Amino acid sequence: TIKVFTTVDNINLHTQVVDMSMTYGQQFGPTYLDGADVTKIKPHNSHEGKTFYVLPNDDTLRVEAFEYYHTTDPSFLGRYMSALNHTKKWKYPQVNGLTSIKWADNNCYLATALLTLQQIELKFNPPALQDAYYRARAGEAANFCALILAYCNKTVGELGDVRETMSYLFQHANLDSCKRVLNVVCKTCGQQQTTLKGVEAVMYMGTLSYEQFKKGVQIPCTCGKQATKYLVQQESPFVMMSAPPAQYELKHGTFTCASEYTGNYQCGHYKHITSKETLYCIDGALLTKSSEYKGPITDVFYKENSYTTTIK
């Protein structure tokens, strides 16, 4: 008989006694240790006082699991530990003061998302996400990347889209204060004003230029004719302008960071462009400096606080 620790959040810990003759699965159910599944493994002398992750089997563990991860999905813990076993072996080099990822298992889109998150203001609602967010900013980004995969229902090696990944993450962050007021003007129907909140207030698909969104874009109307949609007010710490990959010029100082995508749809590669004192390009562990940039951009991130249009 050996005393061990079981947990669902590595915060609230529970002291259980274990027996050598029975595997961990017979006594606790699905059980993990640093990514390894010890469900089929019998306890060893080394497995003493160590902390084990277990699937929630009682109400205390079920409540603690939601308090930390904000999900009751029974597959979350398994999909999380399955990704963690990969992300712990990845390399996270410091590139231009930012934490990146050495390329492995098509993680280009994860590295681009991780680099973007270090440059925009965001507060995650699940304590698991926020804690790993902080640890990732310090350099230990293995747990954070595994959580991103779990929350996005993506597996290691699967090909991912940065805009879709950011969208999933935004829905797990506090964006209630974020407001976007738009106005569409039709020559026949008239003018109509709509107010967006939360994730819809920080993302737009159609154009890469925040300026063009302020000038107005052509959107078809209910009557069938092309109308003009322009930004009236914007109260958010940032905005994300997305468009299908097209050739675009990035000017130093006019944007925070951007996503470059080359290759065929769903099978291609992602690079990260950020606007420090000069334009930097981060391709995983690689770094190149240039004063100008023209290439296939699909996401552009801009800083914002409060904006009210001057058009009437």
Give the residue numbers annotated as catalytic, written as ranges. Answer: 108, 269, 283
Indicate the helix (H) or strand (E) that contains 67: helix 59-69
**Which of 47-63 are b and which e, b meaning 16 or more Cβ less than 10 Å from the residue's Cβ?**
beeeebbbbbeeeebee
Q: Which does 269 bind (CB under 5 to 8 A by kind): Zn ion, ligand XXW, Cl ion, none?
A: Zn ion
Question: From the CB of 38, what's the least distance to Zn ion, in Å?
Answer: 18
**Which of 148-171 are b and which e, b meaning 16 or more Cβ less than 10 Å from the residue's Cβ?**
bbbbbebebeeebbbbebbbbbbe
Which 211-230 positions form the footprint of Zn ion (CB under 5 A)? 221, 223
Phi, psi dihedral angles at 86 (to 5 degrees): -90, -50
Question: From the CB of 85, what's the least distance to Zn ion, in Å?
Answer: 6
Number of residues engaging Zn ion in binding (CB under 5 A) = 12
Q: Tell me if 186 is assigned to a ligand binding site.
A: yes
**Phi-psi category of residue 129: left, alpha or beta, with phi > 0 → left and psi -120 to 50 → alpha:** alpha
Which 134-163 positions form the footprint of ligand XXW (CB under 6 A)? 159-161
Query: For Cl ion, which is the closer residue by CB, 230 or 307?
Result: 307
Question: From the CB of 235, what's the least distance to ligand XXW, in Å?
Answer: 26
Count, residues in the chain: 312
Query: For ligand XXW, which is the closer residue by CB, 161 or 304?
Result: 161
Q: Tell me if 152 is assigned to a ligand binding site.
A: no
> If binding is defined by CB under 5 A, does position 269 make contact with Zn ion?
yes
Alpha-carbon span 229 to 39, nearest angstrom: 56
Alpha-carbon span 140 to 119, nearest angstrom: 17
Query: For ligand XXW, which is the closer residue by CB, 5 or 168?
Result: 168
**Which of 174-197 are b and which e, b meaning 16 or more Cβ less than 10 Å from the residue's Cβ?**
ebeebbbbbbbbbeeeeeeeeebe
User: CB under 8 Å to 26, separation ≥6 — which residues?
Assistant: none
Residue with tokens 């002291």: 15
> If binding is defined by CB under 6 A, does position 74 make contact with ligand XXW?
no
What would the x/- binding string for ligand XXW be over residues 247 to 266, using CB under 6 A?
--------------x--xxx
What would the x/- binding string for Zn ion be over residues 112 to 151, using CB under 5 A?
-------------x--------------------------
Alpha-carbon span 54 to 49, nearest angstrom: 15
What would the x/- binding string for ligand XXW be over residues 269 to 298, using CB under 6 A?
-----------------------------x
Position 64, amino acid: E
Under DSSP, the state recorded for 29 is S
Q: Tell me if 223 is assigned to a ligand binding site.
A: yes
Which 159-188 positions form the footprint of ligand XXW (CB under 6 A)? 159-161, 164
Q: Which does 261 bind (CB under 5 to 8 A by kind): Cl ion, Zn ion, ligand XXW, none?
A: ligand XXW
Query: For ligand XXW, which is the closer residue by CB, 29 or 263?
Result: 263
Proportion of the chain in helix, strand, coil states, percent, rounded to 5:
25, 35, 40
Query: For ligand XXW, which is the closer residue by CB, 23 or 212?
Result: 212
Q: Tell me if 257 is assigned to a ligand binding site.
A: no
Per CB under 5 A, the list member of 61, 186, 199, 243 interacting with Zn ion is 186
Phi, psi dihedral angles at 162 (to 5 degrees): -65, -45
Per CB under 6 A, the list member of 13, 139, 244, 292 interacting with ligand XXW is 244
Q: Give contact residues for ligand XXW (rule: CB under 6 A).
A: 159-161, 164, 244-245, 261, 264-266, 268, 298
